[PDB]
From a paper:
In this study, we determined the crystal structure of the DndE protein from the haloalkaliphilic archaea Natronorubrum bangense JCM10635 at a resolution of 2.31 Å. Size-exclusion chromatography was used for DndE aggregation state analysis, which confirmed that DndE formed a monomer consisting of the five α-helices H1 (residues 12 to 25), H2 (residues 29 to 42), H3 (residues 61 to 65), H4 (residues 69 to 83), and H5 (residues 90 to 113); two β-sheets (β1 [residues 7 to 10] and β2 [residues 56 to 60]); and a long flexible linker (residues 43 to 55) between H2 and β2. Sequence alignment of DndE from bacterial E. coli B7A and archaeal N. bangense JCM10635 showed only 22% identity. However, the two DndE structures from E. coli B7A and N. bangense JCM10635 can be superimposed with a root mean square deviation of 2.138 Å over 75 Cα atoms. Unlike the tetrameric conformation of DndE from E. coli B7A, the archaeal DndE from N. bangense JCM10635 forms a monomer. The difference in the aggregation state of the archaeal DndE protein indicated Dnd protein interactions that were likely different from those in bacteria. The in vitro reaction showed that DndE was capable of nicking circular pUC19 plasmid DNA to nicked products, followed by generating linearized DNA fragments. Although the PT modification occurs at 5′-GPSATC-3′/5′-GPSATC-3′ in N. bangense JCM10635 (11), we did not detect sequence-selective nicking at the 5′-GATC-3′ site when the gel-purified DndE-nicked pUC19 DNA was subjected to runoff sequencing. Together with the result that DndE had similar nicking activity against PT- and non–PT-modified pUC19 plasmids, these results demonstrate that DndE introduced nicks onto DNA in a non–sequence-specific and PT-independent manner. Our results showed that DndE displayed a binding affinity of 48.4 ± 2.3 μM to intact dsDNA and showed a binding affinity of 18.8 ± 2.8 μM to nicked DNA (nDNA), which shares the same DNA sequence as dsDNA but has a nick between dG and dA within the 5′-GATC-3′/5′-GATC-3′ motif. In terms of the archaeal DndE, the preferential binding for nicked DNA is attributed to the R19- and K23-containing positively charged surface.
Phosphorothioate (PT) modification, a sequence-specific modification that replaces the nonbridging oxygen atom with sulfur in a DNA phosphodiester through the gene products of dndABCDE or sspABCD, is widely distributed in prokaryotes. DNA PT modification functions together with gene products encoded by dndFGH, pbeABCD, or sspE to form defense systems that can protect against invasion by exogenous DNA particles. While the functions of the multiple enzymes in the PT system have been elucidated, the exact role of DndE in the PT process is still obscure. DndE can form a complex with IscS, DndC, and DndD in vitro to confer the DNA PT modification, and deletion of the dndE gene in S. enterica serovar Cerro 87 completely abolishes the PT modification at 5′-GPSAAC-3′/5′-GPSTTC-3′ (24).
Residue numbers in the entry: 3 to 116
The structure:
Amino acid sequence: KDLNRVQIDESVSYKLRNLGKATGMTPNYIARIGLTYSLGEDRPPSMEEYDKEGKEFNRYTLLGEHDAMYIALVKKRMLNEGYNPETELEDYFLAHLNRGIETLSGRISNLTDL
């Protein structure tokens, strides 16, 4: 229901510190962009891949004043794809959060110089 506190995967949390170093930006802002990038990706994200042992986010800090809009957008995309928001919203949300951060990392890790 609330979705108040959530945890990304541990290895993704490492990738996020590196994006932080590369970029000079706060984790919330990098994660929000990633989540947005993943929510506009064609393919569904993997529901198998990610643990919840990494960094904790607060929905208020993470999404900000667009929280209801991001939540609703996620619930629509779920119902479309075949998932149930009443059972899987946390898992489905985190699948996009993790995938978003990985996608950014996969390009930006390469820089090394950054």
